[PDB]
């Protein structure tokens, strides 16, 4: 069985020689020193719970049963496998996410970090996790790689795409001040967190205005946003090769009512995985270049495919900087010395029967450093009892420092 | 300036020290031994014309002006670049293609070879070519990388997709014997090269029946084939990063007449690049796994995305073996000791004014070895005055021998 390593060779799964037995005191997967006092193999996982969801585990016979171990079983069973993951980044991500999940007493949390220039997954973590070196008393719900198996309505994180589309289609000018007074579609209330009489395009992102974006959406054909979200990869498979990998939920509708058109512009009526959202934000970070994702190491250059005009995406990335500046909702994500471009917010959870219950997903997505993004990051916190904004700041701050990126502000 | 090498480090572009001069006998990009008898740089291209279209060239100042030299100019100007190309494969491909173009007195020819498991471009060649070590008296028409810049109607090469779709949608059973008598749609004649009263699904591919496939097409909604050809990458960008890279021509039609529906099933009303066709055939070879292409070296595994059910594609690949067996139109492509799965044929050329003239494109596309494809190959011969079938055999035979693939038949 081949070794799974991180992108620089750091060991993440290593086969370890153990003996089997086919006396009463010793015996009551046997250690070498105890078999002699009286052939098979087992796996050792040096990062343990830090990368458990991604790497998975094998069974008694050394067959892969979950995660990378199962997904690349034939490759491993006989080559090594260098993942795209950077273990320093993985460990810091896990640390911040795990402790944030604990502090807010949430059900779970997930974090994905993507290299903007390559499509590489540099970190992929969830909490609660489990120790793959000892699978015992670990509940099934703590084992899912939620970054790829769980889905949620992306809410405000789609809003930058609404502004890009609307500028692109001449529905609005960079000049424009929008009427953002709350209003009704039938009896459906469209309103923001607070009341704002009017806003700038920047303001529409800065205050995350649902009113603002719904008016942009209704000024264009229903097909516009369907086209833009798809270009950014929403509703499309992420293709890592991982078992349990999901492709979200995506409308397949020719005819849209007015309210549906409005709620699409603020991220309802579709669902994403944390990983698809990371890929949205990597396509924002490259200023409109779509690149396929990879959990295995990849050498640059990766040309990818331009799906949206650079100048439009640069403009909107600038607008997004306001979210993490005073007055913006993501102010708690700010990093001393760095420009960041983020969206933060909230989506109501779906219950057992598929009906909304009173519990929330909190999410922060973004790229840094804003003057030329290198990393796309997504932080999702499930049912904590801008909860995700500080976590994003702490994680992204660590990433920038570890990777020696020149301060920006 | 970085070195461009092949996938194993073989040099394909190397910077060479030359001096400049800012006497009457010597001088009349100066050699080192002559500058001393009395600082800048220039490029040397060891494979010369073999890889000229792909690699391109630089100008006096060492700026990239065509091909890889221009496409990856910023990367090179300072890193080396390992292409996906294997120079042994490139050289044999060029040799067979160049001599075939000469022998049939054709305007040009093009050949693309793709690794079925990785998306890698292993060979990309055209003829006539030119020597990039001396750009002088070389006409502009000999400089285009036609594999990516030229487009043609794919004709019979789409037919295997028609059969896959129709089996998949239950329009036909593997059992079925089809009425393949020539017929009219309005006054439009639908007929094959020769008359066949009836054919098996295999027979429909073996004899490349336009009648057969048009009946399959008309038995299904016009959207079916539009969907299948797109899954295989037709009408979609190839994303190598190469300047002049084209994405073919692709219908954008809600309403199809009967004749249009028929001619789509035998490969008219769209146009492809040799490279897009290579990617179609690589997706056939993987039994329905779509993988993005790469001119740079890529490490396995590459999961890609399943776009069509394996069992259907395996079935049709088997049917395709008949084309290169006695009775099939591609019999001259047969390789002693190997099973191959191919389509061969002809498309009428478009003239200056966009009207059909009496000149032809001949093409052979396929995968080998049929029992588990490793290579997808496309050979296109432009305006020779199954012309491409022997060339395919000779090229693919060389590839299989060079790569040490176990005989198959
Ligand atoms: Cl849940
Ligand atoms: Cl021509």
Residue numbers in the entry:
A (entry chain A), B (entry chain A): 71 to 92, 113 to 118, 142 to 151, 163 to 201, 229 to 536, 544 to 567
Sentences from the paper on this structure:
The penicillin-binding proteins (PBPs) synthesize and remodel the cell wall peptidoglycan, a major component of the bacterial cell wall that gives the cell its shape and rigidity. In E. coli, PBP3 (FtsI) is an essential protein of the divisome, catalyzing peptide cross-bridges between the glycan chains of the peptidoglycan. The overall fold of periplasmic PBP3 is bimodular. The C-terminal module is responsible for the transpeptidase activity but no clear function has been assigned yet to the N-terminal module of the construct.
The crystal structure of a soluble form of PBP3, including residues 57 to 577, was solved at 2.5 Å resolution. PBP3 crystallizes in space group P6122 with one molecule in the asymmetric unit. The structure was built from residues 71 to 567 but absence of detectable electronic density did not allow structure determination for residues 93–112, 119–141, 152–162, 202–228 and 537–543. The active site responsible for the transpeptidase activity of PBP3 is located in a long groove that can accommodate the carboxy-terminal residues of the PBP3 natural substrate, the peptidoglycan stem pentapeptide L-Ala-γ-D-Glu-meso-diaminopimelic acid (mDAP)-D-Ala-D-Ala. The transpeptidase activity of PBP3 relies on eight residues, Ser307, Lys310, Ser359, Asn361, Lys494, Thr495, Gly496 and Thr497, found with few exceptions in all penicillin-binding enzymes. In PBP3, the oxyanion hole, defined by the amine groups of residues 307 and 497, is unexpectedly occupied by the hydroxyl group of Tyr514 that is at 2.7 Å from Ser307N and 3.25 Å from Thr497N. The side chain of Tyr514 is free to easily rotate and liberate the oxyanion hole and should not play a particular role in transpeptidation. Electron density around residues 499–510, a loop that connects strands β3 and β4 close to the active site, is weak but sufficient to allow its determination. The N-terminal module provides three loops (180–190; 202–228; 280–294) and one subdomain (88–165) for potentially interacting with other proteins of the divisome. Because domain swapping in the PBP357–577 crystal would involve a large twisting of the (88–165) domain and, also, because domain swapping should stabilize the domain and hence provide a clear electronic density in that region, the domain swapping observed in the case of PBP388–165 is probably absent in the PBP357–577 crystal.
